[PDB]
Task: structure prediction
Amino acid sequence: FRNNYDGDTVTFSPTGRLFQVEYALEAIKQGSVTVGLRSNTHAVLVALKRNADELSSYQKKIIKCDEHMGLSLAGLAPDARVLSNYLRQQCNYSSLVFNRKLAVERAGHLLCDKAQKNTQSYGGRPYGVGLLIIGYDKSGAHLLEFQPSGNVTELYGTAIGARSQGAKTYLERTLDTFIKIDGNPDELIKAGVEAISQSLRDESLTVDNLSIAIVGKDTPFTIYDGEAVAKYI
Amino acid sequence: MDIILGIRVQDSVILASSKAVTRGISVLKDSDDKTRQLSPHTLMSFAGEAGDTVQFAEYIQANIQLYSIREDYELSPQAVSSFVRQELAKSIRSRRPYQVNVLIGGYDKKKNKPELYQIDYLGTKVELPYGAHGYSGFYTFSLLDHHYRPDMTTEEGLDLLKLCVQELEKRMPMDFKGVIVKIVDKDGIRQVDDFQAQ
Amino acid sequence: TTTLAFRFQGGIIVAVDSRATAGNWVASQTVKKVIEINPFLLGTMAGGAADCQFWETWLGSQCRLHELREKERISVAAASKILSNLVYQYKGAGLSMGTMICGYTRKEGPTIYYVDSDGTRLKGDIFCVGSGQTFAYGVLDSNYKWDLSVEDALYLGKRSILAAAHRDAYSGGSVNLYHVTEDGWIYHGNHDVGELFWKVKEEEGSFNNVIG
Amino acid sequence: DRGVSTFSPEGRLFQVEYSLEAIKLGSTAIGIATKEGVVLGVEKRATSPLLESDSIEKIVEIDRHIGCAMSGLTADARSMIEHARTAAVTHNLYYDEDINVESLTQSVCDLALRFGEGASGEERLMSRPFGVALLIAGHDADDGYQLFHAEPSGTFYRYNAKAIGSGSEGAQAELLNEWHSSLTLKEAELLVLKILKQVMEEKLDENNAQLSCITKQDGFKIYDNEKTAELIKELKEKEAAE
Amino acid sequence: GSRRYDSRTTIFSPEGRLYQVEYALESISHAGTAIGIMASDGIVLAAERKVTSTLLEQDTSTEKLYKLNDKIAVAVAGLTADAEILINTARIHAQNYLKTYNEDIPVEILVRRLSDIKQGYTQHGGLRPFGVSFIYAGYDDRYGYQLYTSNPSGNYTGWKAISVGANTSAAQTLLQMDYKDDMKVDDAIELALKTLSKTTDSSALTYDRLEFATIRKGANDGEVYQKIFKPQEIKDILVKTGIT
Amino acid sequence: MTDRYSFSLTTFSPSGKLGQIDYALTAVKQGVTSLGIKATNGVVIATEKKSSSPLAMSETLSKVSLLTPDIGAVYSGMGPDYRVLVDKSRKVAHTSYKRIYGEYPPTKLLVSEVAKIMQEATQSGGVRPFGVSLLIAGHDEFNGFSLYQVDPSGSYFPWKATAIGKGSVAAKTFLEKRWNDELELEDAIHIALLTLKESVEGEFNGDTIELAIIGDENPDLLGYTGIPTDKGPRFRKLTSQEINDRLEAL
Amino acid sequence: GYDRALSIFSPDGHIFQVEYALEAVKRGTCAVGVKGKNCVVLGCERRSTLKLQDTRITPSKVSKIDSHVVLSFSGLNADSRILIEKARVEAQSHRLTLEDPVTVEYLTRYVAGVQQRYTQSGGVRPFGVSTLIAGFDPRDDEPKLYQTEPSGIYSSWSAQTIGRNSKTVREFLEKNYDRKEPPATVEECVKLTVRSLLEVVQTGAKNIEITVVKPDSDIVALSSEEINQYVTQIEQEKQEQ
Amino acid sequence: IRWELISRLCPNSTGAELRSVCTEAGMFAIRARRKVATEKDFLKAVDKVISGYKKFSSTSRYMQYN
Amino acid sequence: QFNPYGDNGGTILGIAGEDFAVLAGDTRNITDYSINSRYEPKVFDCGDNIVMSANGFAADGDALVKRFKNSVKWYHFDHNDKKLSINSAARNIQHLLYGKRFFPYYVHTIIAGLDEDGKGAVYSFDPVGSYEREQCRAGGAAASLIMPFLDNQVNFKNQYEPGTNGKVKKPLKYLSVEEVIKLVRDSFTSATERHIQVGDGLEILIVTKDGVRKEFYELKRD
Result:
């Protein structure tokens, strides 16, 4: 249960941790699985959407902020709007002032700098949203893992969500495999689909449950949904 | 610029206003009326540059009605004149001045005697039995310094107004297209459509 | 430019030319100088093209908001007055504008209001603004009649705009007519002056000074 | 009390956790999505027979093509409805076209996450999240007839058939098997009346429930009392068939 | 977090009344008593200053009666410090009314302005409400003499006779029996003096701790004369009332 | 960021009395015992300088200050609070009168104006009341000599003779017999010296007594000659040598 | 300045401040209003704890917002006249902006909106008043009676009462008033309103104030010498039957 | 009797309050001398208990502690 | 003082067909009296088969193009990548052109595209911020040489059937892409020698159902 030191975000535990941030990270854990991975020349996101009931819909867990970038969701939906809007503002500012497409690492730095100022000052709350930024710049394909704590790191692949982290082992066993795969988007997407399948517990993958995005040089950022994703099922 | 006139007799006060609206080179409407009924026992007649006239008149009407409905008691015409002269005084030094030459007259319940005041566009408060603004004054002060009396009635004051209006229409190149006569007394507000020959 | 509107027992008729001039050279002939705010009331073009066009399009927002808020159609008086106030708070900034707010109501019947960049709001029956408004004001008043039928009113307006555009340099082009009824305005059609002047001169015999 | 925008050990924010269950204290609003349109119905719940049926309006029209129902505490949605109407009309003014229903719902649900103290970086003020859930319904030229659910948590769903409020669990269960993609508008109205009757407190008439409809040609329309009465009679005929 | 130290001044109690104004209405009872009697010929305002000693200055000393306008005077019952700001704002508002209309401000307008000032703090801002209640007296051509009262809650009602402060109930009960509708100024003055004698906590009634403000209208019409009774004239009415 | 303490820190207790006001009164009643009495031809305000450490300089510390060349101030509460109060009061007095009217305000209006600051402090949120009690003495050409005592609540009372501090009760209960209607400046200063004699607990000399007098307009301290309109400042303060001359006059 | 939120969603879903304002209203003076075919009557009582309150300068319980629409309140009297001031200034602004006298529906919507905003804005407690709005729309003779709650919910009532013991007056109106057959005369409406009041006021003919609103800008306030006149035959018809 | 309707018209009430509702519904029939409590009795009892005795409710403060 | 405005030369022209639309403009940009550069395209693809060219201040035109592209991107983002209609783009530009009144953009821009019915539409925008539906019109100081020529072979104005003595108007016909491109090429080849800032090649853009095709034609470099 909540303790005395919960209060507001500006408060240190005697052990030396922020309970607000920890609660944000737990809410990150509670969300659905959105495993993603990248190759030398391609970046693939795989998302498992959730429906309230049979007569319901699915959340767009894949948000596009530019043609050379993309986003994934692992938590609170409304704050994802704010985060995506900020990322789009900075991408458009880069386009209009520098002409340079925003570097993926620079995007992660901006996102962490934004996420800080709620946890640093009174009146703010941490962004309980987990971004898996993908993109491709002149350097190469990149992938990040954003956290409400402000921690941002670049990885070949990861999975944030309910029992999603149980699907990291599939990536780790095949980490040496999908890295050396270049210019082969369909099979990389197939490997990603195999990765998420390990995180299934009750219901299998269907047409309306799989949302897939992929970016690259020859392949711009494209979101797959509906019948367009059944070929990879 | 248009013709606005006002004459106060010992019994009531009569307000006269031109019906012409001269914009550009054509006449948009010759049957217009420039009057505002701030209170059932007070009349408001305005003139000056048309950009500021109607909205300013509505502003003062709004404030007067708000006071009258908040207190359920009628302000004296002197109080209304002070109010409007404050608006002019605070407005002329602003970024966008209000250049409206205005006439305020009405009946007073406390002293049981009607009053009439003249406010220029600069915000000067004067107490006169009669007055005019712009180019219509020259032919009204000269004529009303001869036949006007302190003890006349409204009916022959109407005849004096006919003489004044005849002088205006004879010596003005600008045609006011007639005038609308409205009397202000203890009874209320009444409109008189006879201006040419009475 | 010459825009005119009048009132009679049947409805409201407006007749506006379609000639837009860029100084000496006529910029365009296919412009539409009537802004269809909604199928109840009207709007006209006079002076600044963008200045009138934007705010008259901006009017439709306020009409929709008032209709959704009061569950009833916005009166013509309020529609004219909101634009009057908005122009008033923008005076001295270089805005030059002129328009006719023509609407038809149940309780107040047909109503025509005048609004300019000066901020003056007027209520009347005969209104005409533009570059050649004077060339029109000499026609309708002579032939004005409260019981004119729809066809007679349309022909009177068409002849008035023809006469105004014949003499005024910046007035001309196609002629648009609009009839306002309980439903609202109904588009009558486009009327090019080429088939109008010759038919009038041959049929009625006016403009005798013109050769041919 | 302690904290306003504070999180919880379970990881869901407060207030919105309370607001998500405060809707059940309100009325019952039910909508059904059909290819021929969407049928909405509410529960007036006159606290006394001295109330007026035409007084309390729990169904509003954001636009000719988009309308919504109401549930929970009604007062907070007035800000929601004003903002939604302003957004729709401003989008029409800016883009000379109707605003897409999903976009309008998105532009509405963002306001549900503005509670906070001393907002920094921009001037935005709100004490508590709105405690009202809305059923956005309308038609568009790309997808067709839509029925959304403007939750106070900032999330929204497209819904084929939904009940919110008191009957959010009772009526919703019946909608699972009573809905099909071949449902017609007439049968949709009959089913809505039947489900309301099942969830009714008192006898159902034109004074106790108010219905509406959205269509591609007729647009939004509030059903009159006479048609509601004949719908009640038709439902009465239908229920006792065998 | 700047929360634990907040007292939540503007908070509704479980049963449903405010709590800070509730204790302000107790703070009022601990201040010096004041009395206001509405007579046909005028209005008499009297108050008994609290904490009196031989070293208290009486030559030029008015702490309970204050002048806001040549026609309108007020009586203060409560914390004088908080009453000072209200007095200054009332004077500013009255002078602004004379600026705007060039006519004497009616008592009701000023009473509303002060009530609104109190209510604004009782509503928002999270600040403690003013712990002062006023007694308003004035004249005009609208309703003749007027005698209102104020409260920390910001509500005002008209009264033919009021007494706010210590032993309010006793003073009200004493005055209600002797109050008629036809006294002159002197009868109201002697009634107020008797009430103060019978409600005071001391033994005798010395002129040092009594203050008097009267409104009179004589030969001059339309303008009343406002006189704050100085001690030299204060000791005079004591023998007239028989207390001496 | 700003100030998050926008709420009032003074809250009405259920007993009907202000907490912080009745707490500042307690903080005032303990401390330096000061006093001031008013005579016919002048007003004398006296206080004792409790030298905290004998290595310090009581000369640098000004227990009494000059609000205006006519009006002086004596306190009995907390040092820094009185210093900030006196600086603010001088500033606002200048702003209100020297800028607008052209001369120095009289005692009556200056006291109300300075008490405005304290009565705002007990009202404005996020701040605590001043812990000082001010003794204001001054003279004017119309109301004459006057002495005012300002309490931390903001209430000010006109008093002919007063004392605030640890020995307030004894000095107050001893000043009634000392004081009468007619008095002289030297008589008043002797009265003040006799009263302060028992209330001091340390060494008694000219250095440990801070004494100021408001009397006739002395032109020597004026700082210029040639204007008959003004004749000098009425507020003068005795040095140690000046006071250790009447000290043995007891 | 003050940004702290005062209205917080309780764990059971209600807002504690709003539901406390409900009780704050429940302690106010009883105010009742009924409408006939062309007449609406707003009846109200006054506090009888203290006497020697004059009538001329005593603020009327029913405050005139405009010439055609009037308002009556119950509960905390301090906060209600602020709503009265806001409604009056908003009505004047509406006259300026739309060139149309205000309607009862629009004014009631505005009052509900301002109460809702105060329940929404931070650092401000909700109003402790409940208001009754009555009047006639321009060029329309239909009386409209509206009730506005501190929670922000407004509704039309053929006959509604607020304040202390409002349950008794409500049940009385539930049987001696017919919604489908309203009283046809001003006298009948006044008689019903008066007889409703004696069910709670139980003497106090001096401090019973009644305002009768009529179309075509006609608002009157019946004096004591008429209210006691009605009371005479009302009490005469009570005990003998 | 319609137990579903009675359950619905009693939101966020702990089981002890439901037991008290049952007891009061039984009581109201006794006061009217009826030997059988009907739905109209249960509605009155639930209104009185849940709504009338709402200010003295415990499940709204202690929920925060949990 | 300082002149915040200026001239750069150049001309644009857009013609609306039946199922298509064409936008053409010169690649020459000049300052004061001399040629600045030879190959300066002024027609840009705005996406969704929508094109627009800005004639007037180079800085103002470039800023308008960039901000309109940003607005198009935002509309795609927030409306779930909904297709942008030409009318919506025109009204959005009108709002952009009315962005500030004290410092209006002194640029004449013309857009082109297809409606929801597949019919060619062209809109000309006034620097004050006004626009109207239109078939064909040129822009810049060279419009006077070009626009009256269009009425000859597009509107067929003041032209009557031979043998009818002028009492019969010619029935209108719909031109193919080749017809309009040759008309515009002749128009610009006639304008280049008669107007000093016209030349240095021609860029003409064709909008069709398939997409946008770019064609360039060299003109007189004098």
User: Anything to note?
Assistant: Chains H and F do not touch (no CB pair under 8 Å).
